[PDB]
Design a protein around this ligand. Structure first.
Ligand SMILES: CS(=O)(=O)NCCc1ccc(F)cc1
Length: 185
């Protein structure tokens, strides 16, 4: 790929965070806390999962950013509609307004309904996410493996503004405490 030059500076929106998340002062890192983080509830917060949105909203153009997933056992990454459901249980699918991939139990999968098996030879430590709003494309790149393609969603129905989407995953095992980090340009 040669998408790096559509690089955008993403920051995390604390107001949208699950109440157990800890977002760094620079709003570029997020991790699962070991308790409720002493914030009030609001209608924007994801209630059931350790999810948070980026502050940026996109309705046009080409956008690219990178995320560090080093030493995590579980996470979800991608984009979603600004209007996605925040409360209760739901599945990550384009029908529900999500364009995502994940790591879970030593397998990588794309968030289609049902999920799609990914084929990655080099486990990634950093993921690139590319959105072409006009083309209806969301693509994922393996930065650890020379930028090799992981997955492309095409013919996307964004149906409104998009926000960067993150899930740090649960830490039931004690092996998934590490943060998601937005990588410098
Ligand atoms: C730190 S942990 O060992 O992963 N425990 C998770 C508890 C929890 C459950 C649902 C949430 F929406 C947020 C947190």
């Amino acid at each position: 790929h040669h998408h790096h030059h559509h690089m955008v500076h993403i920051t995390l929106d604390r107001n949208t965070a699950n109440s157990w998340l800890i977002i760094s002062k620079d709003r570029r890192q997020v991790r699962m806390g070991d308790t409720h983080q002493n914030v009030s509830d609001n209608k924007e917060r994801f209630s059931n999962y350790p999810m948070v949105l980026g502050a940026q909203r996109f309705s046009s153009g080409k956008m690219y950013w990178e995320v560090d997933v080093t030493q995590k056992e579980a996470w979800d990454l991608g984009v979603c509609r600004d209007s996605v459901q925040r409360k209760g249980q739901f599945s990550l699918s384009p029908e529900n307004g999500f364009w995502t991939i994940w790591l879970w139990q030593d397998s990588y999968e794309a968030g289609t309904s049902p999920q799609t098996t990914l084929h990655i030879q080099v486990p990634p430590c950093q993921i690139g996410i590319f959105v072409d709003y006009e083309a209806g494309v969301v693509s994922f790149y393996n930065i650890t493996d020379h930028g090799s393609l992981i997955y492309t969603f095409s013919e996307c129905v964004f149906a409104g503004p998009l926000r960067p989407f993150f899930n740090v995953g649960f830490n039931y095992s004690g092996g998934n405490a590490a943060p998601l980090k937005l990588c410098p340009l």
